[PDB]
RNA sequence: ACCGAUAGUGAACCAGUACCGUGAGGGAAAGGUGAAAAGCACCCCGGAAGGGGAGUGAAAUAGAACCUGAAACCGUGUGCU
RNA sequence: UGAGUAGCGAAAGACGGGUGAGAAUCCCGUCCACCGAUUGACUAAGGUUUCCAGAGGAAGGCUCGUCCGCUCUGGGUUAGU
């Protein structure tokens, strides 16, 4: 891969999928600097599958996104996959790459770790 | 392995010569007026606006 | 004219505090609050509350403007330590020292 | 006789199930056959049943003087006719 | 690993009890030595 | 022509007590504000603790961790090198 | 002194919203993971108020702590079988 992030193989894929599905329901999350550079590539590849729209793209995106009930729609229990391919894919129909922006906050208390904020542009 | 001899005040104070820390490297933000770190947001009222 | 402020029975160890007091020593009153606020040591919020009250004494009790106050003296002394015990293998027991320090900040006006 | 020592007013057994049952304190050498007859002699009522429990001493003043609290014997009576065993 | 002290209320009262020391003449001398010194508890 | 708090009884102190052993049994540490509480009203920083002033007192670096306050040891300045 | 050195005692966590001077560590929600002839449910010995509620953050907890089997103030064991 790219960087191990201090975990094992099976634990790393369960954590990267947890952050990607969180950046779709909230569009802005706080995390660590090293983990923000890795989820930056996981989400930007899922938006590319949403701009295609084929049935082969909806199934290639069901391997990453978890099953959560976004209430962003505010009605009918919309899934984390139904928000994708919809309002998210329409916002970046003309943008070619670079759908992520990370901002730096500072070292946190008790850990000395770089807190950051990653959000959809 | 144990120390064969005691340690002096001279030898103890020479080793801690480089046991120091440096200035955080801060600058001034011309939106909040207060000091802040580089490539980061003003922790007081304001934002990055790079 | 001077203004002092002392913090006694501070649980943080002394030689861990002296690493930060060697940074604000000699600086201005504005440059020192920023240096202490943008660092991430354990004794950072403690030294700042002691330097802040030393400026409150310089304006209420004494009469001087804080526009040109500099940090004149900063140092840390010892205190009454706490004796503890850590159980080790084969029945042995070791000693643990919960140390204590005294913080002192002196501001002045240079006149 | 003066078998009853004091009445007890608490959150439980007082203001909750207190209109029909009454919680008292007695001496630690009495049985419920005497507690039953002593209530009828002071308040002129008729008692249905009596339940009595014991309590062990409890430590107090954690610090310099570490002593023990006295033990007690709690009783709970139920009346068939009459009321107002306390005010 | 099993230790050497297993608590027991009956075994502690049937060997070191007050009535156990008051039944023998050599045990009656144990209560006397602790009274002379001034101990708080006599038999335990 | 005895001791003066490492001394004098193990114990000046609420001690054969904390505590340690299944048990018989073994066993410490800890005195001193001031003549008198007259034990710091009120103001300022702080969430507190602790401080800076003002007051009490002959004295507060006599403020209950309270008479005098030695050495080891840990520090902050400077004259020569 | 050794020295800011060894160690911090088998193991999967992530994010959003709250509380507050101060949160990787407390609360609520969702997703994910572990045990399941047992890391689940009853009981004897033994311990002896560690049980519950509202308050507290000096010491104890191998970090933090607004939390606690810790501190403070009130409560809680009902039998003719």
Count of other CB atoms within 10 angstroms of residue A34? 13
Question: In the block, which residue shows the tokens 């984390």?
Answer: A80
CATH code at D1-87 = 3.30.70.330
* DSSP collapsed to 3 states, chain D: CCCEEEECCCCCCCCCCCCCEEEEEECCCCCHHHHHHHHHHHHCCEEEEEEEEEECCCEECCCCCCEECCCEEEEEEEEEECCCCCC
Way the structure was solved: cryo-EM
All residues at 6 or more sequence positions from E44 whose CB lies less than 8 Å from its CB, including other chains: E12, E16
Query: Which nucleotide's C1' is closest to C45 (Cα)?
Result: G22
Is-contact E43 E31, C-beta < 8 A?
Answer: yes
Rounded to an integer, what distance in angstroms lies between the CA atom of residue A46 and that of residue A57?
9
Q: Is C111 exposed, middle or buried (0-12, 13-18, 19+ CB in 10 A)?
A: exposed
Between chain B and chain C, the number of residue pairs with CB atoms below 8 A apart is 19
Residues of B in contact with A106 (CB under 8 A): 37, 40, 43
Which residues of chain A (51-70) touch nucleic strand G at CB < 7 A?
Answer: 66-68
Q: Is D62 exposed, middle or buried (0-12, 13-18, 19+ CB in 10 A)?
A: exposed
Q: Is A110 on the interface with B (CB under 8 A)?
A: no
Which residues of chain C (58-87) touch nucleic strand F at CB < 7 A?
Answer: 60-61, 73, 75-78, 80
Is-contact C36 C25, C-beta < 8 A?
Answer: no
**E19-39 b/e (C-beta count within 10 Å ≥ 16 → b):** eebeeeeebeeeeeeeeeeee
Pull the structure tokens for residue D61: 């003043």
Cross-chain CB nearest to B26 (options C19, C22, C34):
C34
Question: In the block, which residue shows the tokens 């020479």?
Answer: B14
Pull the structure tokens for residue A110: 């008790």
Which CA distances in Å does A96 have to A41, A60, E23? 14, 20, 101
Which of B40, B44, B49, B50 is the best residue to mutate to test the A interface, defined by the most A CB atoms within 10 Å of its own CB? B40
Rounded to an integer, what distance in angstroms lies between the CA atom of residue C80 and that of residue A88?
62
DSSP bridge pairs for C6: C104
What total number of domains does chain A contain? 1
Resolution rounded to one decimal, in angstroms: 3.1
Rounded to an integer, what distance in angstroms lies between the CA atom of residue B7 and that of residue D15?
75
Task: Please report which helix (H) or strand (E) contains residue D45, including its range.
Answer: none
Amino acid whose CA is nearest the C1' of G30: A68
Pull the structure tokens for residue B48: 């990055």
Q: Which chain B residue is nearest to residue A103, measuring alpha carbons?
A: B40
Rounded to an integer, what distance in angstroms lies between the CA atom of residue C42 and that of residue C46?
8
Rounded to an integer, what distance in angstroms lies between the CA atom of residue E15 and that of residue E24?
12
Structural domains for chain E: 1-44 (1.10.287.3980)
Q: Percent helix, strand and coil across chain D, each rounded to 5?
A: 15, 40, 45
Is-contact D35 D48, C-beta < 8 A?
Answer: no
Pull the structure tokens for residue D34: 């005497």
Rounded to an integer, what distance in angstroms lies between the CA atom of residue A35 and that of residue A17?
12
Q: Check if residue C15 sits with its Cβ under 7 angstroms from strand F.
A: yes
Name the B residues in 3-42 with CB < 8 Å from any C CB: 20-21, 23-24, 26, 34-37
Q: Is C82 on the interface with B (CB under 8 A)?
A: no
All residues at 6 or more sequence positions from C61 whose CB lies less than 8 Å from its CB, including other chains: C3
- What is the spatial distance, in angstroms and rounded to an integer, between the CA atom of E27 and the C1' atom of F21? 19
Rounded to an integer, what distance in angstroms lies between the CA atom of residue D18 and that of residue A82?
60
Is-contact A116 A105, C-beta < 8 A?
Answer: yes
Q: Check if residue C57 sits with its Cβ under 7 angstroms from strand F.
A: yes
Which CA distances in Å does A81 have to A21, A69, B9? 9, 10, 68
Question: In the block, which residue shows the tokens 């790459």?
Answer: A97
All residues at 6 or more sequence positions from A115 whose CB lies less than 8 Å from its CB, including other chains: A30, A31, A32, A33, A104, A105, A106, A107, A108
Question: In the block, which residue shows the tokens 């009576």?
Answer: D77
Residues of C in contact with A106 (CB under 8 A): 38, 40
All residues at 6 or more sequence positions from D2 whose CB lies less than 8 Å from its CB, including other chains: none
Q: Count of alpha carbons within 13 Å of E10, Cβ hemisphere only? A: 0
Is-contact A23 A30, C-beta < 8 A?
Answer: no
Rounded to an integer, what distance in angstroms lies between the CA atom of residue E13 and that of residue E11?
6
Rounded to an integer, what distance in angstroms lies between the CA atom of residue B30 and that of residue D28?
81
Structural domains for chain C: 1-111 (3.90.470.10)
Rounded to an integer, what distance in angstroms lies between the CA atom of residue B13 and that of residue C79?
22
All residues at 6 or more sequence positions from D51 whose CB lies less than 8 Å from its CB, including other chains: D32, D75, D76
Chains touching D (at least 3 CB pairs under 8 A) are none
Looking at residue B42, what DSSP letter applies? Answer: -
Query: What's the angle, vertex CA C63, arms to CA C28 and CA C31, rounded to 5?
Result: 10
Pull the structure tokens for residue C85: 């015990």
Distance from CA of B2 to the nearest CA of A (A): 34
Count of other CB atoms within 10 angstroms of residue B41? 19
Contact call for A103 and B43, based on CB within 8 A:
no
Rounded to an integer, what distance in angstroms lies between the CA atom of residue C17 and that of residue A40?
39
In chain D, the largest separation of any two C-alpha atoms, in whole Å, equals 51
Distance from CA of C49 to the nearest CA of B (A): 18
Is-contact C82 C103, C-beta < 8 A?
Answer: no
Q: What is the CATH number of the domain that holds A10?
A: 3.90.1030.10
Q: Check if residue C28 sits with its Cβ under 7 angstroms from strand F.
A: no
Is-contact C32 B24, C-beta < 8 A?
Answer: no
Rounded to an integer, what distance in angstroms lies between the CA atom of residue A45 and that of residue D48?
80
Q: Is C6 on the interface with B (CB under 8 A)?
A: no
DSSP bridge pairs for D49: D78
Q: Is B40 on the interface with A (CB under 8 A)?
A: yes
Helix axes C29-37, C44-60, angle to 10 degrees: 160
Chains C and B touch (3+ CB pairs under 8 A): yes
Which CA distances in Å does D40 have to A76, C66, D35, D45, E27? 69, 83, 9, 5, 53
Rounded to an integer, what distance in angstroms lies between the CA atom of residue C35 and that of residue A78?
49
All residues at 6 or more sequence positions from B40 whose CB lies less than 8 Å from its CB, including other chains: A104, A105, A106, B48
Pull the structure tokens for residue D79: 């009346």
- Output the CA torsion sign for B25, B31, B32, B34: positive
Is-contact C74 C104, C-beta < 8 A?
Answer: yes
Is-contact B43 A106, C-beta < 8 A?
Answer: yes
* DSSP collapsed to 3 states, C57-109: HHHHCCCCCHHHCEEEEEEEEECCCEEEEEECHHHCEEEEEECCEEEEEEEEC
Q: Is C24 exposed, middle or buried (0-12, 13-18, 19+ CB in 10 A)?
A: buried
Query: What's the angle, vertex CA C67, arms to CA C65 and CA C69, rounded to 5?
Result: 85
Q: Is A107 on the interface with C (CB under 8 A)?
A: yes
Q: Is B32 on the interface with A (CB under 8 A)?
A: no
Chains touching C (at least 3 CB pairs under 8 A) are A, B
- What is the spatial distance, in angstroms and rounded to an integer, between the CA atom of C87 and the C1' atom of G8? 13
Count of other CB atoms within 10 angstroms of residue A110? 7
């Amino acid at each position: 891969g790219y960087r191990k992030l201090g975990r094992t193989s099976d634990q790393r894929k369960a954590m990267l999928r947890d952050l990607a599905t969180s950046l779709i329901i909230s569009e802005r999350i706080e995390t660590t600097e090293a983990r923000a550079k890795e989820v930056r590539s996981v989400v930007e590849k899922l938006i590319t599958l949403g701009k295609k729209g084929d049935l082969a793209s909806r199934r290639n995106a069901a391997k990453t996104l978890r099953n959560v009930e976004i209430l962003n729609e505010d009605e009918t229990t919309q899934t984390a996959l139904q928000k994708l391919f919809g309002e998210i894919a329409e916002r970046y129909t003309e943008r070619q790459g670079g759908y992520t922006r990370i901002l730096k906050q500072g070292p946190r208390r008790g850990d000395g770790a770089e807190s950051v904020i990653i959000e959809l542009v | 392995a144990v120390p064969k001899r005691r340690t002096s005040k001279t030898r103890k104070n020479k080793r801690r010569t480089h046991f120091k820390i440096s200035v955080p490297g801060m600058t001034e933000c011309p939106n909040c007026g207060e000091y802040k770190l580089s490539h980061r947001v003003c922790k007081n009222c304001g934002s990055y606006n790079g | 004219m001077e203004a002092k402020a002392v913090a006694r029975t501070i649980r943080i160890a002394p030689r861990k505090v002296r690493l930060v007091l060697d940074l604000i020593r000699g600086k201005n009153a504005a440059e020192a609050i920023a240096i202490l606020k943008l660092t991430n040591k354990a004794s950072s919020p403690v030294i700042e509350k002691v330097l802040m009250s030393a400026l409150a004494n310089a304006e209420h009790n004494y009469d001087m403007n804080t526009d040109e106050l500099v940090v004149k003296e900063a140092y840390a002394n010892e205190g009454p330590t706490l004796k503890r015990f850590r159980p080790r293998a084969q029945g042995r027991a070791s000693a643990i020292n919960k140390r204590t320090s005294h913080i002192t900040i002196v501001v002045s006006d240079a006149k | 006789r003066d078998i009853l020592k004091r009445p007890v007013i608490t959150e439980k057994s007082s203001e909750a199930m207190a209109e029909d049952k009454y919680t008292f304190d007695v001496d630690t050498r009495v049985n419920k056959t005497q507690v039953k007859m002593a209530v009828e002699e002071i308040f002129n009522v008729k008692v249905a049943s009596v339940n009595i429990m014991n309590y062990k001493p409890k430590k107090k003043r954690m610090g310099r003087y570490q002593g023990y609290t006295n033990k007690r014997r709690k009783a709970i009576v139920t009346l068939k006719e009459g009321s107002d065993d306390l005010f | 690993v099993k230790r050497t002290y297993q608590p027991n209320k009956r075994k502690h009262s049937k060997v070191h009890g007050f009535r156990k020391r008051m039944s023998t003449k050599n045990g009656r001398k144990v209560l006397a030595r602790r009274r002379r010194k001034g101990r708080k508890v006599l038999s335990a």
